[PDB]
């Protein structure tokens, strides 16, 4: 989730963005610097 402050300047993290928070597909792709890997991940999510 993006609180809309300065958190998008910090390196993405799967645990705090997609597990502690609800993340968007783009937010997850920001972590897996590979699109296909993100899709895979999303099938679970």
């Amino acid at each position, epitope marked *: 989730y993006n609180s809309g*402050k*300065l958190e998008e*300047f*910090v*390196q993405g993290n799967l645990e705090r963005e997609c597990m502690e928070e609800k993340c968007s597909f783009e937010e997850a792709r920001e972590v897996f610097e590979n699109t296909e890997r993100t899709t895979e991940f999303w099938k679970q999510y």
Partner: antibody
Amino acid sequence: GVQLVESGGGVVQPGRSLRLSCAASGFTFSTYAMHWVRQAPGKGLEWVAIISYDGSKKYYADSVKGRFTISRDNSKNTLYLQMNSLRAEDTAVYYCARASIAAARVLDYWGRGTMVTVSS
Amino acid sequence: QSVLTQPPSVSAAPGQKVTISCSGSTSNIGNNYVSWYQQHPGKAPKLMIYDVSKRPSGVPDRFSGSKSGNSASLDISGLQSEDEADYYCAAWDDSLSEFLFGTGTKLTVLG
């Protein structure tokens, strides 16, 4: 350990241009966002800019919007502050600062600044 | 703007306690975490407290923080000579989209 050293400071005429450098070491420079903070003689701290860990995004204080440019070279582990159209108000010690790994709002490590005197 | 008001000076004897207030507004303190920085005369600023009351490793337990409304406080107990320095609070401002530093407070350990 986390080391940050600013370079490029000195006297410069108003309306001129100067580039500051910040050599970083002791950490994976690429995974961290960086800040620039300055302090005029006998004054308080003043935020200047911030750049994302990868160089993508960046914000500026209205005081330097349009004149200064913040950049970095993640292969050389260096941070840059390109100052143009310098003024007298830019006279100050310029500090390089690292943002915490999970919070840009936190500057966990600073370096000793570099003095910048803008005078004719 | 930089508003974030702080008392220009606070002091107490070695071993006593002191508290430094950081008065801001909703745009900053009200909705953002406050960090505190220590600055000795000719040294690089140092992070003492972040996210209102979190202490980095290394920072003495005698340093603690608090927040209430649009104000934040840095509390220092058992003052030691090395605590004498300038302190600055800091918070992001949603409205200005800028990181603000308080006006600064000089903490002197009475000698």
